[PDB]
Structure formats: C-alpha cells, structure tokens
C-alpha cells in the first residue's frame, strides 16, 4: 500500500528542526514506510504464531 505524500510531509514538519524538503522525498519515504511495515508485520506475525495479533506481539519488534 502507498501512502499520502501530502500527509507524510505534514507529519515530517511537525518537527520544528525540519526545514524545506524536496517534493520527491515524501514519496520515497512512503516506499520506505511500506517496506518497514511489511518487514515489521511479518516478524510480529511470527511472534503471534508462537503464542489474533495483539499490541504486545508488535511492541516486541520496536524493542
């Protein structure tokens, strides 16, 4: 799944330190966000099958 670049840029700039950002940036971050969720969900899925996916099975991936 692809994510809203406009939303991604707005989110990036919730940080006062972040200045101007190249138009193409938010779109690559979207792809990156996509690769991060697939890798993350697939690990958490493993953790779930070693016990429905819960909040705990996920947190143990952002540890």
């Amino acid at each position: 799944a692809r994510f809203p670049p406009a939303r991604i840029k707005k989110i990036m700039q919730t940080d006062e330190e972040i200045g101007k950002v190249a138009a193409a940036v938010p779109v690559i971050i979207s792809r990156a966000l996509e690769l991060f969720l697939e890798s993350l969900l697939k690990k958490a899925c493993q953790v779930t099958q070693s016990r429905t996916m819960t909040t705990s099975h996920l947190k143990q991936c952002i540890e």
Binding site: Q13, E16, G19, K20
Partner: protein, 183 residues
C-alpha cells in the same frame, strides 16, 4: 442580444509593491505584532492586518506581495498600511511600482451544467477529471483567464490583470453555459 445580467464579484486580489530598501526580516518579525517568520520554512515575513483583511509577504529585497483584498483600491490601501508598518519599524520605506498581478472573481449562473459534454465540444480548452477535481477547468485565450465551472452553476474566474478581463470572460462563457444546461 442580451447581457447575462449576472455581474461576477471580486473575491481576491494579488498585488505587488517594491518598498525600495533592504529589509531585515529578523528585526521586523521581532517587533511587528501579527508577524510570522521561519527562514527555515519560508524566506519571507508573513504579516496580516484586519482592515482591509489581508496578508502580505515581505521579502529581504524590500519587495512585497499583498493578497486577500476584494477590490483594486482596497489592495492598494492594505499595501500602504504594510508600507507604513515597515516604515515605523525604522526602515526607509517607499511605495514604488504598485501593480495588480491577479484578480479572482465568482458568480452563479443559477442552473446545473453538463460538464460531461462541455469537455467534448471544447476539449482543447477544457480539463475535466471529476476523480481528481469536481469542477471543469476552462482556459480562455482572449482575454487570457482561467475558469472553474461546477455542476452547480457556480463559476470562478481567475488570472485577470484588470477587472474588465473578468467581465469579458464571463460574458463570453455565459451563452456557452446556457447551451449545456442540465435537465
């Protein structure tokens, strides 16, 4: 035979004026009441005033952009108040080359419109993608103004340098619109 009878109303005006003297935005943003500044995000001060309700973008070169007015002189007044503001803040503020750069107008033909067809008969002047934007985008060549036409009969006109161009554009499009009325 007859004039539409509908007169488009001005909703926005963008003018520019050159104050003719270097400016230190840090300084201006520092004391100016309603002034914003983030050379981080945007290289210009963003000042506003209640009457006429507007917004000015003040750059380092002294040049300024004034937006929000509903008439030519209202925009020139606001532009002047922004000038006196920069002035009182201790800067050699002049008021040079004031120019209206854009005018926006809008009105209601009071009847639905078949955008679906209009974009066929005039495809070379239209861009209609309801998936992307609900309105039909019409590019008139003479005068050179852009119109936003909506199924509801509301119409926006923009791109004008002088209000006559807006009245000329609407009077041209009205009969076209009546030819694509929906029923």
């Amino acid at each position: 035979s007859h004039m539409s009878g509908i007169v488009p109303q001005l909703q926005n005006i963008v003018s520019t004026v050159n104050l003719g003297c270097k400016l230190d935005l840090k300084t201006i943003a520092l004391r100016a009441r309603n002034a914003e500044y983030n050379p981080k995000r945007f290289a210009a001060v963003i000042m506003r005033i209640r009457e006429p309700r507007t917004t000015a973008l003040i750059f380092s070169s002294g040049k300024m952009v004034c937006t929000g007015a509903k008439s030519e002189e209202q925009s020139r007044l606001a532009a002047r108040k922004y000038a006196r503001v920069v002035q009182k803040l201790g800067f050699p503020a002049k008021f040079l080359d004031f120019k209206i750069q854009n005018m926006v107008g809008s009105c209601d033909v009071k009847f639905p419109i078949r955008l679906e067809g209009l974009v066929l008969t005039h495809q070379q002047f239209s861009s209609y993608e309801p998936e992307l934007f609900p309105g039909l985008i019409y590019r008139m060549i003479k005068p050179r103004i852009v119109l936003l036409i909506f199924v509801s009969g509301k119409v926006v006109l923009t791109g004008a340098k002088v209000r006559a161009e807006i009245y000329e554009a609407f009077e041209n499009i009205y009969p076209i619109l009546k030819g694509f009325r929906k029923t």
